[PDB]
Write a protein that binds this ligand. Structure first.
Ligand SMILES: OC[C@H]1O[C@H](OC[C@H]2O[C@H](OC[C@H]3O[C@H](O[C@]4(CO)O[C@H](CO)[C@@H](O)[C@H]4O)[C@H](O)[C@@H](O)[C@@H]3O)[C@@H](O)[C@H](O)[C@H]2O)[C@H](O)[C@@H](O)[C@H]1O
Ligand SMILES: [Ca+2]
Ligand SMILES: [Ca+2]
Ligand SMILES: [Ca+2]
Ligand SMILES: [Ca+2]
Ligand SMILES: [Ca+2]
Length: 671
């Protein structure tokens, strides 16, 4: 019906950053050091004044020790503030109940996981085991169905309470398993860990996973951010409906933004908050990570999250008032590159591979996800028709989509699927539907879509919705110029095709709620880690479970109304997860890409590289760090390991020589 080909090779993109590829165990280890150290004011103004227990006590028996060999600039010194600028707003501190803290690094910093994957951009292999984090070690039984997992022994919460299997178990049973709780990120359903996966407590520092599959090693990546971030059980358990008189909404909102010093396993603790202004975090005294020389991390004493816009993060990182940006909006590229062109610029800018992608996602549930009306249901039915999808992708002039964001060598013709920047990507396996408006018009006419009332907009046949003009509801994020630009352009291209598209502009919190709830026909969405890395949240590549897919979920409780190609992709993804052979895995992903792009699981909008922007005074920033691969750069750069030379240090501390107070109190502690 259409003359499909493979996508054209994008312009050669050098002016990048090269990664220094290292072995997995070059970064950290767990061991006891002969002696430990911390900032002198802690020992002098807090420990000597009674206010805090000595360092050796508040640390695990074997802390997480960062190795100097992997440190880009070596061991650091204490001091300074890391100033972030975010476009998000805090909902509260209950991460495990699906509350957002404002993004742009704050939840990443606060919610430490069993494993860690973002620093893996620098590891040579893609068969690589995620790094040990809160789970210090793990072993597989001979059969490969049981995974014993050992936790950090002797670690404490920012408040002094012990960290144990009870906090790990509280998350599994009362957040993941509990059908009434939805952890942050939207992908923490029990099936994300495998259909039929069980987990049980062995002792205070040992847990045991039981998997249906033999060695589904890919699930260790799911135990990283955002899917397995345990919360303080001693604080959250008395507020949980299963253990109290609170509703699930009462539990979700039990710790609002005004509640200070929320127990965390993270490097910094929230000590101050002003609505639509700022969140201040001070170093966690009970932090369980050290360098090889015994200095307790983080090196940085303070973190700021300025509550602004995502565009203002770029503005501020190049102005020098903000210390970090993920330059990801092509509308912002030229302005930022001009400022970066000055040798006196306070920040450095480095582009990486093309890993930022946008897809048009069509809701494929005809079995009632998001409780559709007659108009909604008729769109679900068009969405599931392969001819309708083929015409929609053919009506898109992808060179015009790319130019509308930024001219030059940034954008690449993106038809959907695995990003062109990933090693798993095969151009020969990617189905490209070139721009063909006339063929697309004819394709829609072949499925009964004709303009009957002469207003230049295609009507359903009289047997469907009374023969009224087709109207599609497109869900978009308010927070970004790119999402808005893409949404408007799409409406314009669909108009030339004869289809009437109505924009549904929502703020990030409401958008995510409307997405995961199924209350959408179509949606503009920036790709998550599975299309940028494959190995991170692999379960999200296909509808392997009832809530794993972003565009095809089933209502609670009902079976998945899978189309044949979805069943094919799910078989390809399940095979990949349990595969131990690398060549098999590489071919499974050529197979996957082919079924995806030919059948149009999603419809690609565009793809381009982003740039990491970091203030020049920071040391230990890894060379060629991507803005997004296994996670966002905020996690990948290992912020608790960043430092500033004493002679280059800023004077930005709003609570100098202060520590976090007790949870629920006013804020920090002096004097
Ligand atoms: O946090 C660092 C980041 O902040 C800004 O982007 C944040 C983004 O927030 C909302 O994201 C929810 C997102 O959740 C899911 O995506 C993943 C995969 O599970 O979950 C993690 C984040 O929770 C990531 O590692 C993702 O790979 C889900 O798949 C998806 O539908 C949701 O959109 C989102 O609503 C909103 O667009 C943003 O505000 C910032 O832009 C980044 O540069 C970076 O600093
Ligand atoms: Ca070393
Ligand atoms: Ca080096
Ligand atoms: Ca200091
Ligand atoms: Ca927490
Ligand atoms: Ca009409």
């Amino acid at each position: 019906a259409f003359e499909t080909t493979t996508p054209p090779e994008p312009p050669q993109f050098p002016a990048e950053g090269k990664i220094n590829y290292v072995a997995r165990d070059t970064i950290l280890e767990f061991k006891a050091l002969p002696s430990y150290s911390e900032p002198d004011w802690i020992t002098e103004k807090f420990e000597k004044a009674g206010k805090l227990p000595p360092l050796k006590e508040r640390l695990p028996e074997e802390p997480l020790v960062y190795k100097t060999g992997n440190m880009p600039d070596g061991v650091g010194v204490y001091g300074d503030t890391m100033r972030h600028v975010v476009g998000g707003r805090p909902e509260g501190w209950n991460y495990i109940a699906g509350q957002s803290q404002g993004w742009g690094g704050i939840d990443i910093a606060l919610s430490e996981c069993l494993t860690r994957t973002a620093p893996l951009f620098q590891v040579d292999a893609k068969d690589t085991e995620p790094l040990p984090n809160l789970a210090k070690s793990w072993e597989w039984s001979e059969d490969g169905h049981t995974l014993t997992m050992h936790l950090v022994k002797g670690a404490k919460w920012s408040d002094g309470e012990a960290f144990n299997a009870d906090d790990v178990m509280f998350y599994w049973e009362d957040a993941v398993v509990d059908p009434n709780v939805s952890p942050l990120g939207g992908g923490a359903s029990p099936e994300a860990f495998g259909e039929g996966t069980t987990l049980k407590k062995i002792d205070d520092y040992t847990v045991e996973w039981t998997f249906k599959a033999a060695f589904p090693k890919q699930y260790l990546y799911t135990m990283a951010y955002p899917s397995f971030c345990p919360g303080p059980s001693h604080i959250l358990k008395p507020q949980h409906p299963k253990y109290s008189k609170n509703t699930y909404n009462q539990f979700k909102n039990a710790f609002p933004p005004e509640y200070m010093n929320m127990p965390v396993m993270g490097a910094w603790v929230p000590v101050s908050y002003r609505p639509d202004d700022l969140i201040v975090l001070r170093r966690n005294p009970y932090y369980w990570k050290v360098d090889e020389k015994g200095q307790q991390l983080p090196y940085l004493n303070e973190v700021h999250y300025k509550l602004s816009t995502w565009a203002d993060r770029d503005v501020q990182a190049v102005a020098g008032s903000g210390d970090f940006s993920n330059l990801e909006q092509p509308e912002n590229f030229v302005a930022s590159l001009k400022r970066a062109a000055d040798p006196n610029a306070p920040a450095r800018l480095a582009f990486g591979p093309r890993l930022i992608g946008y897809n048009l996602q069509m809701n494929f549930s005809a079995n009632g996800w998001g409780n559709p009306d007659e108009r909604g249901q008729a769109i679900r039915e068009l969405n599931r028709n392969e001819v309708f999808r083929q015409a929609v992708t053919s009506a898109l002039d992808r060179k015009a989509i790319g130019d509308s964001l930024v001219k030059g060598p940034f954008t690449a013709i993106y038809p959907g699927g695995i990003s062109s920047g990933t090693s798993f990507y095969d151009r020969a396996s990617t189905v490209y539907y070139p721009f063909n408006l006339e063929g697309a018009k004819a394709a829609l006419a072949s499925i009964g879509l004709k303009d009957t009332d002469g207003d230049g907009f295609l009507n359903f046949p009289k047997e469907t919705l009374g023969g009224r003009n087709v109207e599609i509801t497109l869900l978009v994020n308010n927070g970004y110029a790119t999402d808005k630009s893409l949404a408007e352009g799409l409406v314009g291209q669909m108009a030339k095709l004869g289809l009437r598209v109505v924009i549904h502009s929502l703020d990030s919190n409401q958008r995510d709620a409307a997405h995961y709830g199924g209350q959408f026909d179509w949606l503009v969405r920036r790709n998550s880690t599975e299309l940028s890395s494959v190995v991170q949240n692999t379960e999200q590549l296909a509808p392997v479970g009832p809530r794993t897919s972003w565009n095809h979920r089933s209502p609670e409780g009902k079976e998945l109304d899978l189309m044949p190609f979805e069943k094919e992709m799910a078989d390809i993804v399940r095979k990949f997860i349990s595969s131990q052979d690398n060549a098999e895995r590489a071919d499974l992903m050529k197979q996957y890409q082919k079924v995806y792009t030919q059948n149009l699981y999603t419809i690609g909008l565009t793809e381009y590289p982003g740039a990491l922007i970091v203030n020049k005074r920071f040391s230990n920033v890894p060379q060629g760090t991507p803005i997004f691969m296994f996670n966002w750069a905020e996690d990948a750069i290992i912020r608790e390991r960043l430092w500033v030379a004493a002679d280059k240090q800023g004077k930005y501390e709003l609570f100098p020589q202060q520590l976090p107070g007790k949870p629920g109190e006013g804020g920090p502690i002096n004097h």
